[PDB]
Each structure stands twice: as structure tokens, then as C-alpha cells.
Design a protein around this ligand. Structure first.
Ligand SMILES: *[C@@H]1O[C@H](CO[C@@H]2O[C@@H](C)[C@@H](O)[C@@H](O)[C@@H]2O)[C@@H](O)[C@H](O[C@@H]2O[C@@H](C)[C@@H](O)[C@@H](O)[C@@H]2O)[C@H]1NC(C)=O
Ligand SMILES: *[C@@H]1O[C@H](CO[C@@H]2O[C@@H](C)[C@@H](O)[C@@H](O)[C@@H]2O)[C@@H](O)[C@H](O)[C@H]1NC(C)=O
Lengths: 201, 193, 141
């Protein structure tokens, strides 16, 4: 009655998800338990006990990006016996995906300017403040592309947060896409994509 | 006895590891060769009694320190071995990177592609193995011998502010930012401004 | 006199192959209660001695689990073991200027736990090569 019990983790936002089965009663409930790998005691998430929904936010409970954890879901059915399935060993630092960067595209007369803004994450520093992606992956950088037609593209990349595609013709439509990359762990965000048009001068 | 292989060398570029030798000066064209690599305590046959003058060692681990040896042989009697010491990631030749130029107007837009390694059934590049991979760009015109250089760690670069309506020719090479290791230069690809 | 350079952990290739190796072993490891390279390993080891502790765990994992166990978990085992060996040789020049009664008791208690679990103990260490990689990083740079 329980299947696909897994973590779905984006920018260190760590959500437990599972699904019912071909035997999912009206009042079938699910309880979530989590623990750090190598511990004997299973902790119980206060929010997700005997709940009818099929997901649970474990971000606060798995906040150590350098740690290893496990979680399990217990589904109890009206007619009887309970089924308990747990997740694969979870490491946020290794399993999290990157959200597209927070960008504002600014159309100019003969260029296109792009500003990438820092994204805070739920992982804390030793002193207890939230980190930016740049603070977690020192290797983070931005790859930007400005697409004109199948045959012509402009590329910029760097660690900075300001980018400007220079030398464009006015009143022209362009497609800008900005991507975050973390090479060491081979992480790559989906692109942020702007449909922009240079100002008509 | 039999004379050993001549001019034995490991020809390795972009982790394409080929042990090469030459057929010795020997007026009898009946001659087989056998090549081995070290597996901890013990050697492994890799080419056993081959007629060829080369043996492919691309299956070797990148970070492994390997010693390779080859001998010519006939009947029960074999030659002395000729050994070479070889570690792929430290000794292989860095092939030239690929480059495309998109010159719009009084600018030169470069895009690079690191050489692909044949070790893996996946599209791995030499940039994916070395932690300090970066590109050196060298540029000049066609009436000067004088040069200019720029270094970039990303697959893209723009040469900004030059004289307009002048055809430039540029090349790129791989190198490591923490080593004294230089890769081979590409051939200059030219596009007009 | 006993430090690794950060560069040794920043190869996208070696990190992918090491972590992919650890994941395939850890998927076959359902013993969530016992953790090898975990806080029980760092009990009473000053931070200046922690790299030497990891020097002992790496060479332990190479000699007693990875060398006898080069036959499965391919294709990653073929590339990761030469990498880990290169890390042990850089660290031969490492020696603690003090009392290693806490390191030898914990590295021995480790070798005891892997062997009381027989084969299940050997797969657990391979499933913990990401922890080894990252404890070696955090302890030696
Ligand atoms: C390890 O690499 C696997 C292959 O990806 C290659 O390398 C990258 C850099 C790029 O060149 C690409 O074109 C190559 O195919 C990769 O599949 C694997 O990811 C894992 O498997 C996929 C199918 C997903 O399940 C993913 O979530 C897994 O982590 C890489 N693994 C790690 C840990 O880096
Ligand atoms: C594709 O686009 C190329 C680049 O020119 C771009 O297009 C014009 C309209 C202006 O916007 C200019 O600023 C841009 O850089 C062209 O040179 C090329 O001819 C085009 N080819 C095809 C097949 O459409």
C-alpha cells in the first residue's frame, strides 16, 4: 500500500515523498520517522504522524548538508497490517538539485544586461546564518547564452553576478538563458530563461 | 638469442595509451611480440604473441602508476624485456582543444571544447579529470610577429577592443594552473572582424 | 608536514566515480544502526591528529577491503582504487607528534567491527567511501 518512498531535494530543501498503492483505504494514514545514519533511535517528525497526505518537509530535521540520514514511512490501512518502507541513504550535499538562478533581465538599446541575485538556502554556517549557494560550493559559476537563430549564439560565463551582452541591434528579440553550475559534484541547474527585446532606440 | 624491440615508446594522447615499438633489425621475418602490465605483485599479459608493432593500453586506470614491458619472441626462447614506467593522468599528452569563433563587430567571441578522453563510455573531457584545467589564448594579426595572451577557465572568451576590419588568427591550448604542464596548441582558425 | 592539498578532492571525474562506487555499495547495505566512518571514529581525537586518523582509515580500507575486493563493484573500483592509493602515498610523510592511543584503539575498533560483520562489513566500508573521501578532505585540508 506504500511505494516510491523517497527524498526530493532542491537547494537543500529536503521533502519526503511517498505514494499509496492498489490498496489505499479512505482513512489510510502515514507516519514519518527519520534518523541520522548510524543511530539506533528513530525520531518522529511532530507534524507528520497519522496524516492522510503523501509528503513531509524534513528540511529542519536534515539541515546538516554534510550528514547522512534515513527516513521511513509507516502506512496503516483500515483492514490491517502496517507496511513500513524507508528511503535510500540521503545526503543533501550529494543529492540536492540546483534551482534556476534568481535573475532579472534588463533590456537595453544595443545590449542585454543580466543581474543574478543570491539565493539563500536552509543550510547554516557554524555561527548560524543561512548560506548562499556561493557559500556552499566555492566552485559555483554562471553560464549564460543569448540565442538569436539556430546558427548564432553569444556566450558569457563567470563567477560575477552582472552580465551584459554587448553589440546588439536595436528592437530585436533574443532568448537569454542563465544556468548555475557546480563542476566538482557535477551539479547543473535548469536554465532561467528570459524572452527579451532590446529597446527600439 | 633474439634481438629485443627497438625504439619502444608509450604514445599516449588524451588518455589514448598505445605502447609502440619497431620491428628489430633481423633478417628473419618470423617474429612475435608479447606485452604486459603490472597488477600489484604480478604482470598481466595484454598482447600475447602478436605480430603487430603496437599494443593498446587505454584500459589502464588514469590514476594508476603502471609499468609496461614488451619482448619479441620465437619458439620457446624469448628476449629480454624493455620496460617503461607510465602513469596516464600525469604523463599523457593533452590534446589540442576545439574552438569556434563568432566575430560580430569589433569583437571576437570564442568558444572552447576540451579534448574528449577515450577511457570512458561516457562523454568525459580532459577538463572533467583535471581540477585545474584552464585555457590559454594567444592572438595576433597576419602582418605582425608580436603576440598577446589571455587565460580563461571557462569555455567561452571574448576578445574586446581591437582595430576593425582586420582578420585575426587565434589558437588555444590546455594547461594546468597548479602544474608546469602545457597541452598542445590547436591550428589557428581565422575569422574576419 | 602532514596536509593534503584541496586540489586532490576537486576532480569532477574522481568525485563522480568515488561517489557512484559508494552508492552502489550503500544500496546493498541495510544496516542503518552501525556506521564506520562516523562519530564513533572521531571520539577523543584532537583535530590536529584527525588527518593521521584518516591516514590510518584510508590505508585500512585499501588493504583489508579494497584490495581483496577488487573483483566486484566495477567499473568504478578500477578507477577509484588507484586514486585512493595515490592519497595514501602522499600521506606516508604523516606522523603524529604525540599520543596515538586514541587513534590506534579506534582504528582497531573499526577493523573489529568490519570483521565481526564478515562480508556485510566489507560492503559497508565501500558504501562509506564518500564519507572516507569527505572525512579525508575535512581532516587534511
Ligand atoms: C556521475 O556521472 C554520470 C554520467 O554523467 C556524465 O558526466 C557528466 C559530467 C556529463 O559529461 C554527462 O554528459 C555524462 O553522461 C551521471 O549519470 C551520474 O548521475 C547519477 O545518475 C543519473 C542517472 C541520476 O540518477 C543522478 O541523480 C545520479 O547522481 C553522476 N553521479 C554523480 C554522483 O555525480
Ligand atoms: C542568424 O543571425 C545572424 C546574427 O545576426 C543576428 O541577426 C540580426 C538580425 C541582428 O539581430 C544581429 O544583431 C544579430 O547578431 C545573422 O548574421 C545570420 O544571417 C542569421 N542566419 C539565419 C539563417 O537566420
Amino acid at each position: 500500500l506504500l511505494q516510491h518512498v523517497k527524498f526530493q531535494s532542491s537547494n537543500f530543501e529536503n521533502i519526503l515523498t511517498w505514494d499509496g498503492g492498489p490498496a489505499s483505504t479512505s482513512d489510510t494514514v502515514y507516519s514519518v520517522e527519520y534518523k541520522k545514519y548510524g543511530e539506533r533511535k528513530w525520531l518522529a517528525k511532530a507534524g507528520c504522524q497519522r496524516i492522510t497526505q503523501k509528503f513531509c518537509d524534513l528540511t529542519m530535521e536534515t539541515r546538516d548538508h554534510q550528514e547522512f540520514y534515513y527516513a521511513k514511512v509507516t502506512a496503516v490501512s483500515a483492514g490491517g497490517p502496517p507496511v513500513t518502507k524507508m528511503t535510500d541513504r540521503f545526503s543533501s550535499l550529494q543529492h540536492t538539485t540546483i534551482k534556476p538562478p534568481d535573475v532579472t533581465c534588463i533590456p537595453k538599446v544595443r545590449s542585454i544586461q543580466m543581474l543574478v541575485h543570491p539565493t539563500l538556502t536552509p543550510v547554516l554556517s557554524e555561527d548560524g546564518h543561512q548560506l548562499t549557494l556561493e557559500e556552499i560550493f566555492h566552485d559555483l559559476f554562471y553560464r549564460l547564452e543569448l540565442h538569436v537563430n539556430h546558427t548564432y549564439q553569444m556566450h558569457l560565463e563567470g563567477k560575477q553576478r552582472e552580465y551584459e551582452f554587448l553589440g546588439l541591434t536595436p528592437d530585436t528579440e533574443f532568448l537569454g538563458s542563465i544556468t548555475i553550475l557546480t563542476p566538482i559534484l557535477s551539479k547543473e541547474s535548469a536554465p532561467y530563461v528570459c524572452r527579451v527585446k532590446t529597446l527600439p532606440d | 638469442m633474439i634481438p629485443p624491440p627497438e625504439k619502444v615508446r608509450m604514445n599516449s594522447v588524451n588518455f589514448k595509451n598505445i605502447l609502440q615499438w619497431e620491428v628489430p633489425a633481423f633478417p628473419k621475418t618470423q617474429l612475435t611480440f608479447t606485452a604486459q602490465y603490472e597488477s600489484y605483485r604480478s604482470f598481466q599479459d595484454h598482447c600475447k604473441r602478436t605480430a603487430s608493432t603496437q599494443c593498446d593500453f587505454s584500459h589502464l586506470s588514469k590514476y594508476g602508476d603502471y609499468t609496461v614491458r614488451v619482448r619479441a619472441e620465437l619458439a620457446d626462447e624469448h628476449s629480454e624485456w624493455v620496460q617503461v614506467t607510465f602513469c596516464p593522468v600525469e604523463d599523457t599528452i593533452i590534446g589540442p582543444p576545439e574552438m569556434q569563433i563568432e566575430s560580430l563587430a569589433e569583437s571576437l567571441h570564442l568558444r572552447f571544447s576540451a579534448p574528449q578522453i577515450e577511457n570512458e563510455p561516457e562523454t568525459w573531457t580532459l577538463k572533467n579529470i583535471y581540477d585545474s584545467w584552464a585555457y590559454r589564448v594567444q592572438y595576433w594579426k597576419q602582418g605582425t610577429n608580436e603576440k598577446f595572451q589571455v587565460v580563461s577557465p571557462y569555455d567561452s572568451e571574448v576578445l574586446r577592443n581591437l582595430e576593425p576590419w582586420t582578420t585575426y588568427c587565434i589558437q588555444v591550448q590546455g594547461f594546468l594552473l597548479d602544474q608546469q604542464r602545457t597541452g598542445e596548441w590547436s591550428e589557428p582558425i581565422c575569422e574576419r572582424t | 608536514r602532514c596536509k593534503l592539498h584541496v586540489r586532490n578532492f576537486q576532480s569532477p571525474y574522481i568525485v563522480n566515480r568515488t561517489f557512484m562506487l559508494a552508492k552502489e555499495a550503500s544500496l546493498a547495505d541495510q544496516n542503518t544502526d552501525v556506521r564506520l566512518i562516523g562519530e564513533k571514529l572521531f571520539r577523543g581525537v584532537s583535530a590536529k591528529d584527525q588527518c593521521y586518523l584518516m591516514k590510518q582509515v584510508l590505508q585500512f580500507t585499501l588493504e583489508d577491503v579494497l584490495l581483496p575486493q577488487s573483483d566486484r563493484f566495477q567499473p568504478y573500483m578500477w578507477e577509484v582504487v588507484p586514486f585512493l592509493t595515490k592519497l595514501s602515498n602522499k600521506l606516508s610523510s604523516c606522523h603524529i607528534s604525540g599520543d596515538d592511543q586514541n587513534i590506534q584503539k579506534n582504528v582497531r575498533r573499526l577493523k573489529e567491527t568490519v570483521k565481526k560483520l564478515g562480508e556485510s562489513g566489507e560492503i559497508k566500508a565501500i558504501g562509506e567511501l564518500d564519507l572516507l573521501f569527505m572525512s579525508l578532505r575535512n581532516a587534511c585540508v
